[PDB]
Amino acid sequence: ALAGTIIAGASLTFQVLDKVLEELGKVSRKIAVGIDNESGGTWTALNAYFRSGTTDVILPEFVPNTKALLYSGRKDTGPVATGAVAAFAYYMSSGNTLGVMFSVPFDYNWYSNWWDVKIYSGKRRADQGMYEDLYYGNPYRGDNGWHEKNLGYGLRMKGIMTSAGEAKMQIKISR
């Protein structure tokens, strides 16, 4: 499989993320995530908190500098009207936590996809609290466009999230 593994950061592309979407099979709401670690140091996976949906893989445990992690999520299978919404976190060698949130709702008539990345001081696990901080703060929209900002601590991020039910999200963390 692809999701749950690490690859060369330079090889992370939309084709790779789309192949991640394909391995999820037949599910109407899913997401493929790829985060390129160019922070200057390795990261260690903490945990993933799913508010909606679930995942069939484990967060890549270690993500050395210059490498990208591949992850995926999906709505619960079957006759349930839900999407894939979660926050997951990585503990960076710098001593702070990278929090990542994605939201792919079941409906788009009154909802869009949203996402955000933020650095928290110390070792912080992903939970409802982190999800709300990221979703109700000032998240980017899954608008098929690239967005970038300073994350503080000498790091910044640039990423993109697509707008449909089968979403792709590519992010790069650079020093």
* CB burial of residue 10 (10 Å; 0-12, 13-18, 19+): exposed
For residue 17, what are the contacts with CB-CB under 8 A and spacing of at least 6? 32, 33, 34, 70, 168, 169, 170
Give the resolution to one decimal, in Å: 1.7
The two tokens of residue 174 are 């650079």
Q: Is 49 annotated as a binding residue?
A: no
Answer yes or no: is 163 a known binding residue. no
Host domain of residue 129: 1-175
User: DSSP 3-state assignment of 155?
Assistant: strand
Any known ligand binding at 105? yes
Nearest by Cα to 115 from 127, 126, 128, 104: 104
Reading phi first (left if > 0) and then psi (alpha if -120 to 50, else beta), residue 4 is in: left
Contacts 24+ apart (CB under 8 A), 157-162: 157/117, 159/115, 159/117, 161/102, 161/113, 161/114, 161/115, 162/113
DSSP 58: P
The residues, ordered by sequence, that sit 6+ positions from 108 with a Cβ below 8 Å of its Cβ are 165
Q: Domain count for the chain, please give it.
A: 1
Please indicate if the annotation marks 131 as binding a ligand: yes
Check the annotation: does 91 bind a ligand: no
Q: Measure the CA–CA gap between 60 and 121, rounded to whole angstroms.
A: 22
> Which tokens sit at 146?
């690239």
Residue 112, classified by CB atoms within 10 Å of its CB into exposed (0-12), middle (13-18) or buried (19+), is middle
Q: Which experimental technique did the depositors report for determining this structure?
A: X-ray
Residue 81: is it exposed, middle or buried by C-beta count within 10 angstroms (0-12/13-18/19+)? Answer: exposed
Provide the strand spans (E) within 39-145.
Answer: 43-52, 62-63, 67-74, 84-92, 96-104, 114-121, 140-141
Closest CA to 114 of 81, 75, 147, 78: 147
Q: What is the CATH number of the domain that holds 29?
A: 2.60.270.20
Taking CB atoms within 8 Å and a gap of at least 24, the contacts of 147-152 are: 151/117, 151/118, 151/119, 152/119
DSSP SS3 for 14: helix
Indicate the residue type of 162. Answer: T
Bridge pairing between strands 166-174 and 43-52: unpaired
Tokens standing for 40? 């200057």
The rounded distance, in Å, linking the Cα atoms of 23 and 1 is 7
Q: Please, which residues have CB within 8 angstroms of residue 2's CB and are 6 or more apart in sequence?
A: 16, 19, 20, 23, 70
For residue 34, the surrounding DSSP H or E stretch is strand 30-38
Spatial contact of 6 and 44, defined as CB atoms under 8 Å apart: no
The residues facing 133 across adjacent strands are: none
Strand partners, 167: 31
Q: Do residues 63 and 69 lie in contact, with contact meaning Cβ atoms separated by under 8 Å?
A: yes
